[PDB]
Amino acid sequence: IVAFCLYKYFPFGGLQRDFMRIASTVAARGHHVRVYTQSWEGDCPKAFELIQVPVKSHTNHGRNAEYYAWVQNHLKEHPADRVVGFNKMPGLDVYFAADVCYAEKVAQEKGFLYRLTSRYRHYAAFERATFEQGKSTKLMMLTDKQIADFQKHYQTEPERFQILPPGIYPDRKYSEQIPNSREIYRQKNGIKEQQNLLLQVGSDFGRKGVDRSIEALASLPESLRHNTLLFVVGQDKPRKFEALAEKLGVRSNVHFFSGRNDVSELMAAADLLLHPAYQEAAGIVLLEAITAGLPVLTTAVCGYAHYIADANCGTVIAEPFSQEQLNEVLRKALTQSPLRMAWAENARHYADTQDLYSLPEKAADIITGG
Ligand SMILES: O=c1ccn([C@@H]2O[C@H](COP(=O)(O)OP(=O)(O)O)[C@@H](O)[C@H]2O)c(=O)[nH]1
């Protein structure tokens, strides 16, 4: 019996999609998968034993504490062979690091008033419980930067870390698309031949720099701008970003969608992925774009940004972030067809020659070992 803990399941988040693939791989190996969550949105595999954990606190952190306590009591009466968490909390045998190091985020970005809060104390305590010395929890990591951050703040025993390769779903790959996918999916989405389709995918618009993408779109010269659309796709509220697009005179250029299950089709249709995130532990969409043959504009703060430079299929904007640099990079990318075509070919080559896929199998090996 392998118990999986994540606070919330929904289909449009990276943590959630990594969990789904890892848990499915574990179940397919013949183990019984139990899932504890506060809420589950979308389809659930029939094989999984899904337990909805009741909570009543009015804060996220209060609910998370309630969840931890409830699951401990349930495990007491209904023991599991291994406990795997996708969120930081006490009691885990294995943790999957979908998130950034909180202690480092706070140290770099927050001040005294932020550290006064019960919320800060909770998230710090639950991260500490997972990473501190003396714990047995195995720590499945996505980047070297994560490891460096956790070592800085917790001095975690190095042997407990294991970096995993990416786990991009093969359905995004250019070679897994129907013939004429670019034409068919552009037509399906109302995209004309002469139009430049910019695509931004992710369920946290603020964190992922949707504002920076809209600013970049608005900065384009008039004729080019008239021919350029931005699709913003994710389970988040568009309001603030609609207001910004209106301010900048590009509301009609920007199309907002809730969570979509056809991202593979949008990537086949698109001309560039824009992902100028403020914060991103890894960024699955960056590598999905690589596999789709879709060139990428992103920011150096993203854990997976280096892959864009490695694949030579776009531009990574350096810190400190310069909007003017993003603006010019966008203008160049849209005006220089040979550059964009070379990037696209480079992406396809990298997707065909690199391991961007084995995460679920390697994670399942760690989880089921012994
Ligand atoms: O509307 C959406 C939004 C996101 N995703 C998928 O959700 C994952 C997002 O992971 P990422 O690491 O990019 O961002 P996170 O959600 O973890 O911040 C990727 O597989 C996306 O393709 C999706 O299918 N539809």
CB 122 within 8 A of CB 65: yes
Report domain extents, the chain.
1-168+355-370, 169-354
Reported residue count of the chain is 370
Integer CA distances (angstroms), 245 to 217, 280, 324, in order? 9, 23, 17
In the reported structure, the alpha carbon of residue 260 is separated from the centroid of ligand 1 by a whole-number distance in angstroms of 9
CA of 283 to the centre of ligand 1 (A): 8
355 is in an annotated binding site: no
Burial of 259 (0-12, 13-18, 19+ CB in 10 A): middle
Q: What Å resolution does this PDB entry report?
A: 1.6
Say which experimental method was used: X-ray
Beta strand 33-37 with 138-141 is unpaired
CATH of domain 169-354: 3.40.50.2000
Instruction: Please tell me whether 111 is known to bind a ligand.
Output: no
The protein residue with its alpha carbon nearest to ligand 1, atom 14, reads 14
30 φ/ψ angles, rounded to the nearest 5 degrees = 95, 10
Superfamily, domain 1-168+355-370 = Glycogen Phosphorylase B; (3.40.50.2000)
**What CA dihedral angle connects 234, 21, 37 and 129, to 10 degrees?**
-100
Ligand 1 touching residue 263 (CB < 6 A) = yes
Closest Cα to atom 22 of ligand 1: 285
Cβ–ligand 1 contact at 15 (below 6 Å): yes
- Residue 285 CA: which ligand 1 atom is closest? 13
| Complete edge-to-edge strand list for the sheet that includes strand 138-141 | 49-52, 33-37, 2-5, 82-85, 94-96, 138-141, 161-163
Nearest to 34 by CA among 7, 10, 4: 4
Ligand 1 centroid – CA 259 distance (Å): 9
DSSP 103-156: HHHHHHH--HHHHTSHHHHHHHHHHHHHHSTT---EEEES-HHHHHHHHHHH--
Burial class (CB in 10 A: 0-12, 13-18, 19+), 186: buried
Ligand 1 pocket, residue 285 CB under 6 Å: yes
C-alpha span between 208 and 301 (Å, rounded):
11
Cβ within 8 Å of residue 197, ≥6 positions away: 186, 189, 191, 229, 231, 269, 270, 271, 272
Contact 267, 257 (CB under 8 A): no
Quick one: DSSP state of residue 269?
Answer: H
Ligand 1 close to Cβ of residue 282 (< 6 A): yes
Tell me whether domains 1-168+355-370 and 169-354 share a fold.
yes
The span from the CA of 347 to the CA of 37, in Å, is: 37
